[PDB]
Amino acid sequence: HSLSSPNLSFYYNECERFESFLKNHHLHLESFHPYLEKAFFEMVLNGGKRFRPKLFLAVLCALVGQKDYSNQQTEYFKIALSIECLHTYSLIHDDLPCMDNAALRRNHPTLHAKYDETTAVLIGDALNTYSFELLSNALLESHIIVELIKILSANGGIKGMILGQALDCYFENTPLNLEQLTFLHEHKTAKLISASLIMGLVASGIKDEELFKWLQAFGLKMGLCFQVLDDIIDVTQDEEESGKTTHLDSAKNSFVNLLGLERANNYAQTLKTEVLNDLDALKPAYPLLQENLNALLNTLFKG
Amino acid sequence: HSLSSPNLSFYYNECERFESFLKNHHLHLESFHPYLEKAFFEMVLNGGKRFRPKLFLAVLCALVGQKDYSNQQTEYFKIALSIECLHTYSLIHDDLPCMDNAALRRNHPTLHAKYDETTAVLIGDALNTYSFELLSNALLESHIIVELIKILSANGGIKGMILGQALDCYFENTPLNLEQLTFLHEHKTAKLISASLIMGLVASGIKDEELFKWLQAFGLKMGLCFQVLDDIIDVTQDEEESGKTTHLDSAKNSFVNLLGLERANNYAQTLKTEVLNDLDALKPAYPLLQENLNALLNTLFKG
Ligand code: DMA
Ligand code: DMA
Ligand code: DMA
Ligand code: DMA
Ligand SMILES: [Mg+2]
Ligand SMILES: [Mg+2]
């Protein structure tokens, strides 16, 4: 890392510490199944940018004082892991033969390729449910926990992430317009990204309705940008760099298919610019939060 | 109905009222998907004995006074519906082509037969997540809600229902012993049945650790009995009576395959007898609870 403020340095360190927490997270299963214990958490451990926990932590590390943060660190990490579990579950089900049929994710074989289809369906299911187990076991105030579960379940469920996925699959042959593809991407991807942001504020304990509505809106815009960049990743990166299977392009609905690569790059660059401009509005009122988010987004936007 | 006490009559009425609540439960989805709104709740509406909500209500109606119950009825019904949603999700994923490949459930076509495989996977996922949305939106005390989510997620997840399902599918060709099949059935089926029982006590607000441990143990024993009777249902009932596809018998692990029908009936009859005998221990201390559970189990055990 370069020359960073104490606040930003603290945030970076917590992201590393969360990765250790995730790596040392063991679930003990006693049964006569040969591999279920290992295969359950395998996809979480396999890799990932941890973008959503980083979003969660960016809000949280900036809003609560380091000493007040310290006692509840493990509990905050449980919440961050619950977001990652739900995200990982969606990846597993996304890669299914009946869905996107992918053989590789996070530089490793997919659960249905290594084991079988059934195993992949069921572990996806397990991680879906496990997200809420982790959340309910985090030792924060009860009303905070309830509110966190409300957010994760609304955004990750039928009105959010799943609507996006169902649209993506149903209209895989139908060419959609830009407004429809934007809607799809907002649901498929942006909903969970905005959830991560507002869950941070909720987990902090701080009442701030104005900031809540800001973070939620920011996440939808930035989450759309995230997916547009992901669509570009498919044609610009090989499997060794992306960690995941390159889809056969024209078979599905992406920004690159709709606009062509050159126009999609233009759309993405101007979307990036607006995202970072919106982030400047945080700087007077919430400078510590701006700092964390700006650093996270610069790292993402560099490639 | 026959001649029942006010308490038992109240319980019967609440079960009917919950069915109305479920039937009038609407989720509004605005999107350009032609059928997702309808298909989401379709399998819940299609039918079912509502055995698990009835278990939940049997505990709850008996433990809390009718006037104290009245104000929170809707909230209690949300919790009961969350159990049913999670149960329905497991049915949807159970019937998948890669799993049990069933064309019929609850006297209706399965989601993958009526729509497609992808739709079935995703709606199952949605109902899984939706269970926790319903639970977190029930207006009871926060610490009760957290505790309810803890129970439903532990028992319905990797250490419970899913372990059972993964065992069932992995060892579909391996013939298991009686101890192994019992273990499988306890996880696959009994875990969610015992959850329904203890969730009732938790939802009531009453601290009773002795009753908690009793209900949990009772549910594992009775839930095993439930699955043994279900195994017998496959060979004794046609599709019009069961509402669901008759599996091709010897291909999987059931009590009928392991013991043969005659021995399985003997095992089931003596299991039933022990269940009802265990229920007699409730009668001095918790007579209202005994009454509700005994009536529910007599109805189930009659066929
Ligand atoms: C919706 C979408 C783009 C999922 C892939 O997410 P990601 O780029 O965060 O992958 P990972 O979690 O492996 O970092
Ligand atoms: C919620 C979720 C997993 C969406 C996947 O979208 P995608 O198939 O475009 O993502 P990827 O390119 O990472 O498979
Ligand atoms: C594990 C198992 C036996 C599932 C079928 O449950 P059920 O007999 O309660 O079916 P339904 O929910 O349709 O009444
Ligand atoms: C948790 C769950 C749905 C288990 C199904 O067991 P099964 O396949 O024996 O049940 P059914 O005979 O109802 O399909
Ligand atoms: Mg994909
Ligand atoms: Mg089945």
Question: Summarize this, please?
Answer:
Two copies of one chain form a homodimer. Chain A has 303 residues and is an all-alpha fold.
Structure notes:
The structure is a homodimer of 303-residue chains. Chain A has 303 residues and is mostly helical. Chain A has a single domain (1-303), classed as Orthogonal Bundle (Farnesyl Diphosphate Synthase). Helices cover 71% and strands 1% of the residues of chain A. The first copy, chain A, is built from 15 helices and two strands. The first copy, chain A, has a two-stranded antiparallel sheet with strand order 1-2. The longest helix of chain A has 28 residues, at 209-236. The PDB classes it as transferase. The entry lists the keywords structural genomics, PSI, protein structure initiative, nysgrc, new york structural genomix research consortium, nysgxrc, terpenoid biosynthesis, new york SGX research center for structural genomics, transferase. It forms a dimeric assembly. Crystal structure of geranyltransferase from helicobacter pylori complexed with magnesium and isoprenyl diphosphate. Chains A, B are Geranyltranstransferase (IspA).
List the helices and strands and how they pair.
Two copies of one chain form a homodimer.
Chain A lengths: L5 H18 L12 H10 L5 H13 L2 H5 L2 H22 L9 E2 L2 E2 L1 H4 L2 H20 L5 H15 L4 H10 L7 H27 L4 H28 L2 H4 L12 H5 L1 H20 L6 H15 L2
Antiparallel strand pairs in A: 1-2
Helix pairs in contact in A: 1-3, 2-7, 3-5, 3-10, 3-15, 5-7, 8-10, 9-10, 10-11, 11-14, 14-15
Bound molecules: dimethylallyl diphosphate (DMA) (4 copies) and magnesium ion (2 copies).
One dimethylallyl diphosphate binds next to helix 11 of chain B.
InterPro entries (chains A, B): Isoprenoid_synthase_dom_sf, Polyprenyl_synt, Polyprenyl_synt_CS
Family (chains A, B): Belongs to the FPP/GGPP synthase family.
Protein name (chains A, B): Geranyltranstransferase (IspA)
